[PDB]
Design a protein around this ligand. Sequence first.
Ligand SMILES: *[C@@H]1O[C@H](CO)[C@@H](O[C@@H]2O[C@H](CO)[C@@H](O)[C@H](O)[C@H]2NC(C)=O)[C@H](O)[C@H]1NC(C)=O
Ligand SMILES: *[C@@H]1O[C@H](CO)[C@@H](O[C@@H]2O[C@H](CO)[C@@H](O)[C@H](O)[C@H]2NC(C)=O)[C@H](O)[C@H]1NC(C)=O
Ligand SMILES: *[C@@H]1O[C@H](CO)[C@@H](O[C@@H]2O[C@H](CO)[C@@H](O)[C@H](O)[C@H]2NC(C)=O)[C@H](O)[C@H]1NC(C)=O
Ligand SMILES: *[C@@H]1O[C@H](CO)[C@@H](O[C@@H]2O[C@H](CO)[C@@H](O)[C@H](O)[C@H]2NC(C)=O)[C@H](O)[C@H]1NC(C)=O
Ligand SMILES: *[C@@H]1O[C@H](CO)[C@@H](O[C@@H]2O[C@H](CO)[C@@H](O)[C@H](O)[C@H]2NC(C)=O)[C@H](O)[C@H]1NC(C)=O
Ligand SMILES: *[C@@H]1O[C@H](CO)[C@@H](O[C@@H]2O[C@H](CO)[C@@H](O)[C@H](O)[C@H]2NC(C)=O)[C@H](O)[C@H]1NC(C)=O
Ligand code: NAG
Ligand code: NAG
Ligand code: NAG
Ligand code: NAG
Ligand code: NAG
Ligand code: NAG
Lengths: 237, 35, 50, 99, 366, 34, 50, 49, 86
Amino acid sequence: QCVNLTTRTQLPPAYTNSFTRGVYYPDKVFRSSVLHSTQDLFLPFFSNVTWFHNPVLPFNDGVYFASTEKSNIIRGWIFGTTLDSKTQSLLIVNNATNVVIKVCEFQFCNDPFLDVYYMKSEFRVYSSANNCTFEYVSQPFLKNLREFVFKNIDGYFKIYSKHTPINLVRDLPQGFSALEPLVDLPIGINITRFQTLLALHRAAYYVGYLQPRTFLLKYNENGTITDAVDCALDPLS
Amino acid sequence: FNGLTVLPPLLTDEMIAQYTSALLAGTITSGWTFG
Amino acid sequence: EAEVQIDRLITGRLQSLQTYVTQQLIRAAEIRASANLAATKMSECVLGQS
Amino acid sequence: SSTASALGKLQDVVNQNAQALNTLVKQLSSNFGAISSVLNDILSRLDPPEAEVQIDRLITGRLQSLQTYVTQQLIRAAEIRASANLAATKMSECVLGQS
Amino acid sequence: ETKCTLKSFTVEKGIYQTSNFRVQPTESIVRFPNITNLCPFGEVFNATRFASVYAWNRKRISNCVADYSVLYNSASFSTFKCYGVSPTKLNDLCFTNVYADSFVIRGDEVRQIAPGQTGKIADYNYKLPDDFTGCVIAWNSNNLDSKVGGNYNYRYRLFRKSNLKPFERDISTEIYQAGSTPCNGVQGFNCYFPLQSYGFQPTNGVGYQPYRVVVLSFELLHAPATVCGPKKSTNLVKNKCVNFNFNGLTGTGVLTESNKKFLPFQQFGRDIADTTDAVRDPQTLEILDITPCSFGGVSVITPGTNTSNQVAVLYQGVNCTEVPVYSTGSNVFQTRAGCLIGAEHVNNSYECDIPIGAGICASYQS
Amino acid sequence: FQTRAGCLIGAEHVNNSYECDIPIGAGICASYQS
Amino acid sequence: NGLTGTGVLTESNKKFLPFQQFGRDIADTTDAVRDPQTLEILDITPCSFG
Amino acid sequence: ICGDSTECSNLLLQYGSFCTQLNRALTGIAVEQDKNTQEVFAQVKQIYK
Amino acid sequence: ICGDSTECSNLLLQYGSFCTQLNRALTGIAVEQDKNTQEVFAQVKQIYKTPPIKDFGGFNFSQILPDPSKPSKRSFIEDLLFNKVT
Ligand SMILES: *[C@@H]1O[C@H](CO)[C@@H](O[C@@H]2O[C@H](CO)[C@@H](O)[C@H](O)[C@H]2NC(C)=O)[C@H](O)[C@H]1NC(C)=O
Ligand SMILES: *[C@@H]1O[C@H](CO)[C@@H](O[C@@H]2O[C@H](CO)[C@@H](O)[C@H](O)[C@H]2NC(C)=O)[C@H](O)[C@H]1NC(C)=O
Ligand SMILES: *[C@@H]1O[C@H](CO)[C@@H](O[C@@H]2O[C@H](CO)[C@@H](O)[C@H](O)[C@H]2NC(C)=O)[C@H](O)[C@H]1NC(C)=O
Ligand SMILES: *[C@@H]1O[C@H](CO)[C@@H](O[C@@H]2O[C@H](CO)[C@@H](O)[C@H](O)[C@H]2NC(C)=O)[C@H](O)[C@H]1NC(C)=O
Ligand SMILES: *[C@@H]1O[C@H](CO)[C@@H](O[C@@H]2O[C@H](CO)[C@@H](O)[C@H](O)[C@H]2NC(C)=O)[C@H](O)[C@H]1NC(C)=O
Ligand SMILES: *[C@@H]1O[C@H](CO)[C@@H](O[C@@H]2O[C@H](CO)[C@@H](O)[C@H](O)[C@H]2NC(C)=O)[C@H](O)[C@H]1NC(C)=O
Ligand SMILES: *[C@@H]1O[C@H](CO)[C@@H](O)[C@H](O)[C@H]1NC(C)=O
Ligand SMILES: *[C@@H]1O[C@H](CO)[C@@H](O)[C@H](O)[C@H]1NC(C)=O
Ligand SMILES: *[C@@H]1O[C@H](CO)[C@@H](O)[C@H](O)[C@H]1NC(C)=O
Ligand SMILES: *[C@@H]1O[C@H](CO)[C@@H](O)[C@H](O)[C@H]1NC(C)=O
Ligand SMILES: *[C@@H]1O[C@H](CO)[C@@H](O)[C@H](O)[C@H]1NC(C)=O
Ligand SMILES: *[C@@H]1O[C@H](CO)[C@@H](O)[C@H](O)[C@H]1NC(C)=O
């Protein structure tokens, strides 16, 4: 139940600096007052990250998705190859109540949207859903930046998340914050592209890509990652 | 070569010869006092 | 089985390299002793009368 | 009192000893070509007629590492003995009399 | 012991190092989660229809209690062969994410399913990794999977551009260009369909009757345990040198209450040189602690068998709290080098005869 | 800069001569000022 | 001609006797080869590393 | 011991740090040689003529 | 090597007397350390003591003589040396 979006809004694909974001806990082992070196997928320091002020973007290996959203406009995500019923598709929705994760052969139009009526009840993102594979429900995820990391390893979809209040106007803060592991989806899907959802009334977010490399991580007294060093960045590194 | 290298010494031969010359001039002229 | 053959080659070459390193260490120790003797002789019999 | 790094030699000796111990204890976490680096898992997970092969791989690797450590210790002890002999001679000649 | 170690019947004055000392464990503790639901295995083993080899059925099972004893003793299986695990120990282990693959193959191809094995099914239909861990079960299905009218529904891959990948599924059906000219969707010269059908008939002899094969694959500690076997859970014991089997992690030591500040997602910490220090019990979710039981070398101080035959015993680096033949012996002395039994402490000070350590040493008088 | 020991990047060559503090080799060495 | 290896090739003034195909110095290290078509002597040196 | 081979490097990887200490010993030897020469020959405060 | 495993000990038992050889060297090393210290420091037969009144012709040795106030009975320089290095 959707039609083509006539008002083709254009989000300028600007470029900004990655700085030192994209650090997450790599394992499930506690440590304290130790400097540990680990090799894994990470966001390289001081790289370009794309800024949007809805197009189609490839999944590649892993995705760092950040949003300095206000009033919680962002709703969910769509994952798949061609976003049609012919191939398995995945949907994440975070509405006012419990979040829903769905894996079915869903069908979508050109520009799916959620929309709100001002009494808030509207959902026509998809068009058809015949064969379903996985269903899940969890606690809702939600001036305040929210960062997520999506990885697909060995038939496991890892989602790491972290939200922190922000006061800077536009650019990503030049601070440090690790990303705790949030959810593991134990379903194997061949994802290659993904989308985004907005809560329109009836647009700034940053996207970066990961690469495999080695990091050095310092644990404080209480076991919280507090500082990091990227190996292949500079002779001093 | 097959992964092996030889590194040059820090002191070149001219400097060693200069040290020997300095020592010998000092011992000729000043005796043992310069030690 | 290629990996087994590679394992044999690896362990043999590692053993040879270890032997070379140990021999170099012994020779270096002896050379250091000789150098200390030379330094003492230079200090005593050149800068003074013994 | 003011200037630091004036006692480099003793600190270097301590550092070398600690580093040797650290690498020796860290060598315990290597597969050495086996299927696991922990002996209890291979014991309690697999059938003995080739668990013995895995244990043999672990044994030979660890024994080789221990031998190398012992040889390094011997060399270091020799040089320390030479230094101690020099110190004893110096203290006998320059403290108990005028050189 | 001194005489045996020195390989002599006479021992001169001195202190010798004979053997070592360790504290034996006392009891056992087992701690498992409170999960008791059964595991579905007859659903997949007794399925009426199995898919073809190229479309082998893939199933994922987790969060269940599986008893392998009732399947180990079953005689309905012609072939029962595992690689990385001894079958009798499957009832004593816990895994996560068990994968089951079921298919139907010919009788003579059973050997093809093996790590480091080459053939036709092994490289064109189902490639097994060289380091694969798991088990394979095979059994003849000529009585039910063979039709007198002929079974052509079962097909196997015959041609491909190159070799497959381990644990890869291929369902693409395109004409194969066997020559130097495109087929253009025409199955003629140098043009064949990559799938070849079967002629399963009951009248056929051995080597052609249908065979049903199910393979199981596991993992080795990549997530908190979810699928174990039927086992009994004991309670927790404190301040005792005991051995534990915490969720498959087996180890011996003394368990102590620890104040380490975990975070809501870690299961067990450690420290420098990857030594397992603290753990979390599954049922109660408490921050425990692991410390090795006391151990250390022992030494004998003797004045020489030439003179006397009484000795003293020194336990190195051992606090005088867990000493236990010398359970009592004589008065016991405590030093910076350990504990000493069989000698009497005095207030005097003489020259050193038999060096002991920390500035103290012993001599014969007793 | 090209030296008997190899090639050096990120340093400037001067005509003076000071005491050697960070030995490089072949009779030359580098220091901090740059 | 079946002799395989990595390196950089230069002109060489070595004079092979009319029936050899390649040369070496010590420890079986090939240094010069003769191309089967032009029939001339070249020189092989390893690629830089350090 | 591998001569630029990927599989050889992967197989060697599971032997632990057998090569850090070798280079450490060799560097120690080189530094010792330099110190030997410096301490045997450099015994003059100035350069006389 | 074995970490309290009987099977590992049995398998190691057929490797000859390597462990006796290994343990026989470390003991010699320790004895050598003890002898080194003893032969470098134990140079005198009696423990001499300085007189309580100190008038050494104007020289002032107060920084090197032991300090009775400190529990360690070490001099100032020795305390500085002990604190300087880990
Ligand atoms: C995952 O999906 C992508 C499509 O998003 C697949 O890419 C296709 O690969 C085939 C084989 O080379 C090509 O013929 C197609 O043109 C590709 N499609 C696109 C859109 O590029 C990919 O093969 C899939 N991977 C798996 C393992 O199924
Ligand atoms: C949803 O599931 C049905 C049931 O399997 C699919 O229908 C089958 O699709 C396969 C695809 O090749 C065919 O081979 C079968 O013959 C179909 N069977 C029937 C009874 O229709 C259906 O295609 C699935 N939907 C989508 C979009 O893939
Ligand atoms: C590690 O955790 C401890 C325990 O909470 C922290 O110590 C106290 O923490 C509380 C609450 O955070 C503070 O109100 C106290 O002032 C802290 N006491 C002290 C002596 O610091 C400790 O601060 C934490 N460390 C870090 C680096 O966050
Ligand atoms: C598949 O079905 C067979 C029945 O033909 C099961 O085998 C019997 O299971 C019952 C269970 O109560 C036992 O009492 C019998 O002794 C079993 N054998 C026979 C010959 O009847 C078999 O267990 C089923 N498969 C699985 C995996 O459970
Ligand atoms: C040997 O063990 C005993 C028992 O643990 C130690 O005695 C404890 O000492 C501490 C420190 O003074 C006290 O807090 C405890 O209350 C004592 N416990 C008991 C039961 O007495 C003793 O200190 C240990 N000896 C050494 C040398 O460490
Ligand atoms: C010898 O030197 C020490 C200092 O090394 C002198 O001790 C100082 O004495 C003055 C006057 O009594 C005090 O103000 C200082 O605080 C003392 N310094 C220390 C470090 O204690 C000592 O007086 C000197 N002795 C003589 C005889 O001159
Ligand atoms: C980032 O993108 C800009 C495009 O304007 C480009 O000029 C810049 O070189 C890029 N950064 C890096 C590190 O390549
Ligand atoms: C939000 O999603 C949940 C999914 O469980 C659904 O039950 C609920 O009705 C949704 N609320 C609205 C306002 O759409
Ligand atoms: C399992 O159930 C028991 C029974 O109440 C409870 O005491 C225990 O905490 C539970 N453990 C888990 C991990 O749910
Ligand atoms: C030790 O033995 C000698 C002869 O073997 C003997 O003369 C001496 O008395 C013995 N020492 C004793 C008994 O203390
Ligand atoms: C000797 O030691 C004991 C205990 O070891 C002590 O009671 C006694 O006071 C000390 N002095 C004398 C003179 O006995
Ligand atoms: C001094 O340095 C300059 C710049 O590096 C160089 O051109 C010149 O040749 C050097 N020597 C003299 C004598 O100027």
